[PDB]
Design a protein around this ligand. Structure first.
Ligand code: FMN
Lengths: 153, 76, 77, 77
């Protein structure tokens, strides 16, 4: 009924996507102007403060779209909120796998700066679709309340 | 750092070690009832963690060395 | 070192508390000067004798070797 | 329901467009072969008898398309 292949292509890293048939050119548009936001691809597999992993192509796109939601682009606000929901889901699906954005940013190409770039690209699309972080407690505080660890501040 | 406060894997928690816990001396016994002061050294070498260091004049001759290894100790 | 009594403290990690620091265990201990008087050592008789006869000195005034006949040992080039 | 961003890009002048979702590749095609009708862009801001303003990018395109309507391209009228 409603399936549309969207590819995030760049240099030597790609990400495939599933889109509703309806919302496939809103998602094509954000993808299109977003692949110009990036500098000329590097077959040397990295650029300074540009993509470093496939986890960064989606992260850079999540904040790109979530910015155009809060940006004053009218008549097109309902449709951007949907491209947003899909990328957020596809991200929590494959990339985070239920786990928090911080401990999953802790495993990308170390510039000590792009690890921040992913963590804010998230809480930018998190708040641009209005979702308030689910009250998990960390394995740390879990085992703190389970009196294994004693955490001071 | 920051991500060590927001993790979901079970292995996500770290414990700073007390060298007393980790490297504290111990005792252990064999299937033939010997006792070994258990350390990284004795467990490595396979004998009492007390060792006679190599010394030119005295630790040179093949007697004292083989006699000290027959006495069950690590010498150089 | 010359015994298990002084060895023990480092073998534990207790020595290091005297210096305002947490316990710092050692994975063993090493003996040199001690074994010289072992009967299975080749150290001559009157030598081994003169060895024992050296009145040691504590960690206190060990550096005194450099200037004086401290204890029974002196330092020389 | 039906909005599709079409950009007329060239040298240092651009024009943005709103297109039905449906009729977005017909409008992509006319734009595409039309940005080849123009000579290599000039960052000196003008060419002789080529675009001079943004009013000329659209004007050149209006006649480009309107020509392919009266041109014998069937099934696509
Ligand atoms: C007579 C004599 C010969 C020694 N020869 C060596 C040697 O050939 N190589 C080495 O690494 N240490 C040598 N040492 C030093 C010991 O290996 C060890 O580090 C030291 O003697 C321990 O200090 P202690 O005599 O107070 O127990 C020698 C010590 C003595 C008294």
């Amino acid at each position: 009924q409603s399936l549309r292949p969207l590819v995030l292509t760049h240099g030597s890293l790609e990400f495939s996507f599933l889109v509703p048939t309806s919302l496939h050119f809103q998602a094509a548009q954000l993808k299109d102007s977003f692949l110009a936001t990036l500098p000329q691809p590097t077959e040397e597999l990295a650029q300074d403060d540009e993509p470093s992993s496939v986890v960064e192509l989606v992260a850079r796109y999540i904040a790109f779209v979530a910015h155009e939601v809060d940006e004053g682009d009218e008549d097109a606000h309902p449709t951007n909120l949907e491209v947003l929901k899909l990328i957020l889901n596809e991200f929590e699906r494959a990339f985070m796998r239920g786990n928090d954005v911080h401990a999953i940013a802790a495993n990308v190409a170390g510039i000590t700066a792009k690890k921040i770039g992913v963590v804010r690209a998230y809480y930018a699309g998190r708040a641009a679709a209005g979702r308030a972080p689910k009250p998990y407690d960390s394995a740390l505080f879990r085992a703190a309340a389970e009196n294994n660890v004693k955490i001071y501040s | 750092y920051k991500p060590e406060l927001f993790d979901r894997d079970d292995n996500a928690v770290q414990f700073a070690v007390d060298w007393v816990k980790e490297h504290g001396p111990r005792l252990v016994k064999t299937s033939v009832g010997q006792t070994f002061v258990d350390t990284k050294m004795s467990r490595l070498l396979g004998v009492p963690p007390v060792m006679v260091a190599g010394m030119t004049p005295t630790t040179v001759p093949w007697d004292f060395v083989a006699a000290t290894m027959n006495a069950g100790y690590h010498i150089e | 070192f010359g015994g298990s009594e002084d060895t023990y403290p480092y073998l534990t990690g207790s020595w290091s508390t005297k210096f305002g620091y947490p316990p710092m265990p050692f994975d063993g201990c090493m003996f040199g000067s001690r074994m010289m008087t072992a009967k299975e050592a080749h150290t001559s008789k009157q030598a081994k004798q003169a060895i024992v006869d050296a009145p040691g000195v504590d960690d206190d005034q060990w550096e005194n070797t450099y200037k004086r006949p401290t204890g029974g040992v002196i330092t020389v080039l």
